[PDB]
Amino acid sequence: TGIEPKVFFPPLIIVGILCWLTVRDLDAANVVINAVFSYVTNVWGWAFEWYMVVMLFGWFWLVFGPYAKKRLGEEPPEFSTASWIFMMFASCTSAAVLFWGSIEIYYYISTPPFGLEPNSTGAKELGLAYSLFHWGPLPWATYSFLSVAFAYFFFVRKMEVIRPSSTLVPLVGEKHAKGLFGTIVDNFYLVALIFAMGTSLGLATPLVTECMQWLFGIPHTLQLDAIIITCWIILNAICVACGLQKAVRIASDVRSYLSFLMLGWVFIVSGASFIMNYFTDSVGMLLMYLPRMLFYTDPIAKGGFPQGWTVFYWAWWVIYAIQMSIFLARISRGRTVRELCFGMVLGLTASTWILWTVLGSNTLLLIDKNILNIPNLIEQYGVARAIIETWAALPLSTATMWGFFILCFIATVTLVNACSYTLAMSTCREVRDGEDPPLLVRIGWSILVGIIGIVLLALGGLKPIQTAIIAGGCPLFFVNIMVTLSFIKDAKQNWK
Template identity: 35%
Template sequence: MKRDTIEKPIFYATIIVTLLVIIPMIINPEGANSLMNSAFGKLMNNFGWAYLWFAVMALIVCMYIAFSKYGNIRLGDPDEKPQHSTFSWVAMLLCAGIGSSLLYWSSIEWAYYFMSPPYGAEPFSVAAADWATSYGLFHWGVSAWAMYTLPTIPIAYVYWVRRNPSMKLSTACSGVIGEERANGWLGKAIDIFFIFGLMGGCGTSIGLGTPMITAGLNSLFGIPKSFAVDLIIIICWCLVIGLSLYRGLEKGLKQLSTLNLKMAIFVLLFVLLVGPTFFILNTMSDGLGHMFQNFAKMSFWTDSVGGSGFPQGWTVFYWAWWIVVAPFMGIWVAKISKGRTLKELILAEIVWGSLGCWMSYSVLGNYALHLEINNIVPITEIIANQSTYDAICAMLLNLPMGKVILFMFVSTMFIFLSTTMDSAAFTTALVASKDLEFGEDPVKWYRVFWGFLLAALPIALLFSGGALRALQTSSAVA
């Protein structure tokens, strides 16, 4: 007789809470946007300092654990061997953590800082360029990855060392709220809000990825931007996600992540070697130096006197989103880290995660900056008059074999989003399951169901006009 492993209270409550939240957003997206933006603005302005301090403390705590005696704790038996090769392991944690957003923002984020720089710098000046090449590295660097890593530590320890078969956020919180509360209504509420927040996080990736792929197809093949094209892209995504989830961790997610990382490395190496190589390398050095020189300043700055709103609109907002996605990353990375020590786990996330993001920002962002300041491609003008997606396409088409590399870029984004949604659905199925034996995965149909739900919900809101933004903001507020 098959066991019922579906955690029905979490399953049904998540559906009900989600419907109660999104139905008003679909009916009145403008009103929902206004309400959520107002709440989020007050949260950022009044408690932005707390987000900044949390990021710093997360980095300090992670480094302490890594280099203390606790860093030698092995996840599993004392002589346990790593479950996955280092390359596959790093590929799975990277592809889950960054998604298609990395390729998008690393290509274009610098332009916003160049046009509207912080600290009173003159727009389009040398000082603006210094901040443009360093702030993206900061936002996707060690502080951000430390926030990903922090929840991974207790989740991995409870699961692999104490061998608690329940891989849920509520279980990891049992040391703080008590085991009775973790298994009761409070624990279920934590898991429900985790899933709801993850839906908003997935919505961000879909909201960025779909228009970028549509713009790429338009530039490559002249396919018009339309609802039908978006729908076809989404259907293809769902098919890839469903197949990968059905095949499981080893045959699906692992292979897809490994392929994804290899494709991303190829794109970056191509741009580096074929583009303005020495400018990219020199500007990368400048950006890293500028970031490390101003790391403390960037970490604590709220601009309470100047009131520019820059740290709230960028750093605090980024930190809020890293925190929203952090529990998902904690569960996912813990699941794939059998046989690793806590030190290996912490350094892999913070060091490899940061290096991967820095490489993408340095290559794509600095190449685009080179085009802008040398009047080769007016990136900022295209952003102002057309869209960021058109600017990215124009940037890549300027390369030798531009259409080939744009196709590779779009394909990599497609797979990046697939791996992110795969790991998110796998994690959600774990959280919404019960009575799983140690090391057991959720049933196949349940994994596939969550994959389709995580993809379909933001898409429905995206096409309703403005409601997706409200969902993203509300999940961060929650």
């Protein structure tokens, strides 16, 4: 069970150097950060939207295409169509998603798009529609093209696939893919992916620690955000070093149910009728503004909206793009290309749309109640403090806050455990899929990830987080397109 170096070291080095250089000087890093962010987005952000817009076109090409009816492997599907869907529905709930779900509608209102007056009933009607855009069917649809390529590689070519290059053979020649070309590709990929995993952890953390501080009293400090990234890593090490994963799967489920439960709670207490009317009104907005939004760059007013939200989000999506499609691919053996397009979108969107319309209309009602001053809270304490204030403003606050705490807790564990497996896996040679990798390489990464998060938690602000991501997405833009093209050259000749 080797530790291939061409895919182990370049990551580790690069993450360390940059992570180090950043800890050295925070003030200066932040200046660099803000330089990068603004460049990429203001100069290039349009290419991101066009990416998503193409991928969308081709969800259609898949659905009304020639490979439309093609079956994804001969065998029958090893899941009940309902089990399958629920499996998608249940993947979507991350720690970090609770973060955005809870706050993003606020900024949508605070500083709106399309030159809208803030906190205007108008920027409010439009608030949730923008959620439904950024986490709607429209974005999920883009995944279907790679979800089908990985599906087809997996079963129609019975290919073994661990890293991005291992699919590239047809596009570039077994020569270059086995070579360094594929090694650079697998490295850029990994590095980008690492940052993402970290920034995700960085969102998760303050939610967990602000919760503790709320229930307990323990000041949310940095020496405490890092305390808990180590617990996570320790706790991780223990679970994996004990082959305890059997029970980790059982906790993951406890997580899914808790989150439906919670979402369900926030729904009924906050006022379904409203939520329904608001969700409805919102769908028509989405439907009518969709095209405007798909391509929004606000080039005259130069308000940052598209760049800071869409272009930031689109790019996060471009990163996690492969990790999911691979997952959508496995849970989906033996279905038809079209079966899958219609399924993943219907499924996932159900999940995403519920969340963001529940939490958002909660935190929106809170806004029209003046229960809490969200802006003054963010100002003096930081985003997460506010987020928790919007959960705690709820009836039976203490219990409600226990649910969230646990939820965020067991969720982040899941997350960590997950990043480590996948990371260790793409960095070890001669390892069968479904097999547990070397404990040292595994827990090893979990520390490097947890290290990234604090460095971002340290740098302070969201600008680090989003630069991290926007940067990440830049290589993956072409990685993704590459895999996609690869999948195409190799089905033009074999599928038929």
